[PDB]
């Protein structure tokens, strides 16, 4: 099996001919620039690279890359800047002056975020470069969360051989109550659909179907009710159930004994952790002790997708995250 | 490798000739009775089986077991009952009458617990039989936690091939603050020593050494300080450190990057989870996705050890848990 290639093949079938454009603000980053050349040579994702044109071209030359067919935009000299300034001023509802917007939009991450907001591109991948802060920051200001969603959350694809799961929230929210967990469950189901999965979402705990009693157990039980309510409202093509211990969620024989007649019978493929402590630890255990590759974090909940690279990313990481982001944009 | 046999070999070297006696209250349980015969045929653990003598002998016959060399005690007719009644009345400080004690001590779990308290046996393993409640309940009343320990906690040996880790608290305490986590860390270190390990205890979080800020991160940071204080006080032969994400605790290269100069460098063998949600989920992930066997739960913190079997245990589980309990008694 080749789990990463198999995930990409599902995303490619969705993306083929859709012409999705992903902004890569960090054109002076070697990994990003090289990944842009690779994406350009597919049909699925069109990279829009930002930076100083002379510096980016010099870096390409150093790297022995032909970037002549890549769209490369320097914010300060772009014919689009004027419209993006005006839109950013309108979006900010008077919180930013025209002069401030003219200044801010010279920043590659702000400019890139505005390309997405203005419909000139579909999503954005950044974070490889030290000068990029949190990729998500301008996105929160400009793009915002989707109607009905309070906050972003972070998911990972956990992949090994022929197995592919989604785990979340593993990165973002350190304090979660029932409403927050239910939000994560619904967003994760939607993300799983974007990625071509048939979502079966287990809300995890140390209890299975009332086997323990505590405030944290009640929290997850109430989250299941709210998530099911939100899903059914929207006729989401997903099953959401809980509370389950991890084995009851993923082992049919355990489910049969501990959760008889539940909607899930040990066949979950999306796992919602009851806290960030649990999720961060749990994906790291699956990664190291299970030998699963952890692809992410992938952000969900925004009106348009943006995702954040590690400073230590590889070229392949940029390529893969660009595909994931492009799939999210559909 | 044979991870379970290898753990038993360490425990056998400690137990050889020490004549440790483990009470098995459930002599009318097939698994327990068969395990008693197996333990009797070693030198390490002496089983003290309780029950109605005629019923236990009839069950042995049905099972084709020779139990003639096993110590078998019927509480109601035991020559020891009178002394155990008097001791139980004294231990209860007037909360139980002599008549009530005479009645209660006919119960195999109470009688067995009193054998331990009175120094007639060293530990106790129960829980296979439906009529046994929580094995620990009489223990809490009679044996109690060790001086300086508030509560029991539950650990698992996570074993695969040549790898052996301790995870806790994975079973008992649904609400833990810094003091409670520090208690678990110190008890787990002590348990690891009992089991022949050189304990390197990582206190887990979603943060590594200040990489995130939240109340839950502060909780674990403060727990590390308190645990180190308690360990150093007692010149415990253990290292306790944190806070660590799971990969920083167990992967040297991650530790070097994320926790430079920390006391642990990716070489933890004892893992203290920041909550029961995290621990219960985390061991189940290690078990199912990692293919680790999870041996437990093993209780720690009592003045004398008692441990609890699943109703669905095997014969081997009773045998193994008897060895673990006997090791704890040293
Ligand atoms: Cl559902
Ligand atoms: Cl669990
Ligand atoms: Cl990355
Ligand atoms: Cl230490
Ligand atoms: Cl972690
Ligand atoms: Cl068991």
CATH number for the domain harbouring residue B281: 3.40.50.10750
Residue B92, Cβ density class (10 Å: 0-12 exposed, 13-18 middle, ≥19 buried): middle
Domain harbouring A315, CATH code: 3.40.50.10950
Whether the ω angle into residue B309 lies within 30 degrees of 0, i.e. cis, is no
Residue B79, Cβ density class (10 Å: 0-12 exposed, 13-18 middle, ≥19 buried): exposed
Residue A98, Cβ density class (10 Å: 0-12 exposed, 13-18 middle, ≥19 buried): exposed
Find the DSSP H helices in A41-167: 53-62, 81-91, 98-104, 108-117, 136-142
Two tokens, residue A215 = 């405030």
Mutation pick from B165, B178, B206 vs chain A, by most beta carbons of A within 10 Å, is B206
CA distance B153 to B151: 7
Look-up of token digits 């063998």: B269
Phi, psi of A76 (to 5 degrees): -65, -25
Residues B183 and B325 in one domain: no
Residue B196, Cβ density class (10 Å: 0-12 exposed, 13-18 middle, ≥19 buried): middle
What's the number of domains chain B is made of?
2
Q: Whose atoms come closest to the Cα of A296: which ligand?
A: 3
Two tokens, residue B44 = 């390490």
B280-315: b (≥16 Cβ within 10 Å) or e? bbbbbbbbbbbebbbbbbbbbbbebbbbbbeeebeb
Evaluate whether A113 touches A102 at the Cβ level (below 8 Å).
no
Residues A184 and A127 in one domain: no
Two tokens, residue B16 = 């050889």
- Beta strands A163-168 and A153-160, pairing class: antiparallel
Which of A28, A23, A55, A53 is closest to A39 using CA atoms? A23
Two tokens, residue A24 = 């890569």
β-bridge partners, A186: none
Look-up of token digits 């939009």: A105
Structure-determination approach: X-ray
Angle ∠(B281,B282,B283) on CA atoms, nearest 5: 95
Two tokens, residue B128 = 């296979």
Phi, psi of A97 (to 5 degrees): -80, 165
The DSSP code sequence of B81-109 is HHHHHHHHHHHTTTSS-HHHHHHHTTSHH
Residues A35 and A9 in one domain: yes
Q: Strand, coil or helix: what is B22? A: strand
Judging contacts by C-beta atoms under 8 Å, the chain B residues touching residue A219 are: none
Two tokens, residue A272 = 């919602």
As a whole number of Å, the end-to-end CA separation of chain A is: 27
Angle ∠(B156,B157,B158) on CA atoms, nearest 5: 105
Evaluate whether B50 touches B75 at the Cβ level (below 8 Å).
yes
Judging contacts by C-beta atoms under 8 Å, the chain B residues touching residue A250 are: 288
Two tokens, residue B24 = 């098995």
Residues A324 and A262 in one domain: no
Residues A11 and A119 in one domain: yes
CA of B206 to the centre of ligand 3 (A): 18
Look-up of token digits 């409640």: B133
Evaluate whether B74 touches B51 at the Cβ level (below 8 Å).
yes
Q: Strand, coil or helix: what is A168? A: strand
Look-up of token digits 């991948």: A125
CA distance B328 to B297: 13
User: In chain A, which residues touch B (CB < 8 A)?
Assistant: 158, 174-175, 204-206, 212, 214-217, 245-247, 250-251, 273-282, 284-292
CA distance A120 to A17: 17
Evaluate whether B135 touches B126 at the Cβ level (below 8 Å).
yes
CA distance B250 to B271: 9
Look-up of token digits 């004549």: B19
Evaluate whether B256 touches B247 at the Cβ level (below 8 Å).
no
Two tokens, residue A251 = 């082992």
State the CB neighbour count (10 A cutoff) for residue A31: 19
Mutation pick from A154, A221, A277 vs chain B, by most beta carbons of B within 10 Å, is A277
CA distance B165 to A262: 33
State the CB neighbour count (10 A cutoff) for residue A209: 18
Look-up of token digits 């860390």: B185
Maximum Cα–Cα distance for chain A, whole Å? 66
Residues A5 and A137 in one domain: yes
Residue A222, Cβ density class (10 Å: 0-12 exposed, 13-18 middle, ≥19 buried): middle
Find the DSSP H helices in chain B: 3-15, 30-40, 53-62, 81-91, 98-104, 108-117, 136-142, 178-194, 215-233, 246-250, 252-258, 276-288, 315-329
B131-147: b (≥16 Cβ within 10 Å) or e? ebeebbebbebbbebee
Phi, psi of A44 (to 5 degrees): -85, -45
CB contact under 8 A, B174 and A284: no
Residues B156 and B297 in one domain: yes
Q: Strand, coil or helix: what is A271? A: strand
Evaluate whether A244 touches A268 at the Cβ level (below 8 Å).
yes
Residues B76 and B169 in one domain: no
Q: Which domain holds residue B117?
A: 1-144+303-330
- Beta strands B71-73 and B45-50, pairing class: parallel
As a whole number of Å, the end-to-end CA separation of chain B is: 27
Q: Whose atoms come closest to the Cα of B239: which ligand?
A: 4
Total H helices, total E strands in chain A: 13, 11
CA distance A192 to A201: 9
CA of B307 to the centre of ligand 2 (A): 21
Task: Pick A288's closest partner by Cβ from B174, B250, B281.
Answer: B250
Look-up of token digits 């167990």: B250
CA distance B50 to B52: 7
Q: Strand, coil or helix: what is B124? A: strand
Q: What are the Cα distances from residue B24, in Å, to A184, B51, B224?
A: 47, 9, 38
Last residue before each break in chain A (C–N > 2.5 Å) = none
Q: Is the dihedral of CA B113, B115, B117, B120 positive or negative?
A: negative
Which of A175, A163, A153 is closest to A298 using CA atoms? A153
Residues B276 and B130 in one domain: no
State the CB neighbour count (10 A cutoff) for residue A60: 22
CA distance A55 to B322: 70
CA of A167 to the centre of ligand 2 (A): 14
Q: What is the resolution of this structure in A?
A: 1.4
Residues B150 and B271 in one domain: yes
CA distance B165 to B267: 11
CA of B208 to the centre of ligand 5 (A): 8
Look-up of token digits 């454009």: A21
CA distance A282 to B283: 9
Judging contacts by C-beta atoms under 8 Å, the chain B residues touching residue A274 are: 277, 281
Find the DSSP H helices in chain A: 3-15, 30-40, 53-62, 81-91, 98-104, 108-117, 136-142, 178-194, 215-233, 246-250, 252-258, 276-288, 315-329
Q: Which residues, including other chains, have CB under 8 Å from residue A262's CB and lie 6 or more apart?
A: A209, A241, A244, A255
User: In chain B, which residues touch A (CB < 8 A)?
Assistant: 158, 174-175, 204-206, 212, 214-217, 245-247, 250-251, 273-282, 284-292
Judging contacts by C-beta atoms under 8 Å, the chain B residues touching residue A284 are: 245-247
CA distance B95 to B74: 25
β-bridge partners, A49: A24, A72
Which of A172, A165, A202 is closest to A185 using CA atoms? A202
CB contact under 8 A, A284 and B214: no
Q: Strand, coil or helix: what is B223? A: helix
Q: Whose atoms come closest to the Cα of A264: which ligand?
A: 1
CA of A279 to the centre of ligand 5 (A): 8
Which of A281, A224, A252, A232 is closest to B247 using CA atoms? A281
Residues A149 and A298 in one domain: yes
R_g (Cα) of chain A, nearest Å: 21
Judging contacts by C-beta atoms under 8 Å, the chain A residues touching residue B215 are: 174-175
Element housing B239 (H / E): strand B239-244
Task: Pick B276's closest partner by Cβ from A206, A280, A289.
Answer: A206
The DSSP code sequence of B158-196 is EEETTEEEEEESSSS-S---HHHHHHHHHHHHHHHHHTT
Residue A242, Cβ density class (10 Å: 0-12 exposed, 13-18 middle, ≥19 buried): buried
Residues A194 and A311 in one domain: no
């Amino acid at each position: 099996s080749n789990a990463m290639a198999d995930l990409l093949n599902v995303l490619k079938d969705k993306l083929s001919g859709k012409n999705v454009k992903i902004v890569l603000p960090e054109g002076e980053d070697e990994r990003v620039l090289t990944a842009a050349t690779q994406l350009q040579a597919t049909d699925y994702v069109t990279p829009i690279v930002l930076g100083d044109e002379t510096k980016v071209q010099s870096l390409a030359q150093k790297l022995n890359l032909d970037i002549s067919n890549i769209e490369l935009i320097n914010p300060a000299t772009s014919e689009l800047k004027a419209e993006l300034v005006q839109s950013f001023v309108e979006r900010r509802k008077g919180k930013t002056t025209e002069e401030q917007a003219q200044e801010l939009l010279n920043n590659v991450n702000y400019f890139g975020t505005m390309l997405v907001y203005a419909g000139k591109a579909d999503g954005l991948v950044s974070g490889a470069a030290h000068s990029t802060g949190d990729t998500v920051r301008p996105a929160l200001q400009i793009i915002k969360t989707k109607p009905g969603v309070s906050r972003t959350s972070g998911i990972f694809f956990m992949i090994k051989g022929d197995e592919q799961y989604i785990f979340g929230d593993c990165a973002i929210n350190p304090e979660l109550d029932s409403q927050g967990l239910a939000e994560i469950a619904v967003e994760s189901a939607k993300s799983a659909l974007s990625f071509g999965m048939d979502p079966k979402v287990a809300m995890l705990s140390f209890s299975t179907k009332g086997s323990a009693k505590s405030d944290d157990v009640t929290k997850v039980q109430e989250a299941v009710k709210l998530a099911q309510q939100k899903a059914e409202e929207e006729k989401l093509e997903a099953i959401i159930d809980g509370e389950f211990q991890f084995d009851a969620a993923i082992v049919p024989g355990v489910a049969e004994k501990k959760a008889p007649g539940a909607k899930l019978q040990g066949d979950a493929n999306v796992f919602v952790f009851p806290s960030l402590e649990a999720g961060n630890i749990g994906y790291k255990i699956a990664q190291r002790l299970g030998g699963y590759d952890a692809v992410g974090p992938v952000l969900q909940g925004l009106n348009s997708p943006v995702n954040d690279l590690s400073r230590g990313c590889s070229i392949e990481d940029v390529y893969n995250l660009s595909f994931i982001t492009a799939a999210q944009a559909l």
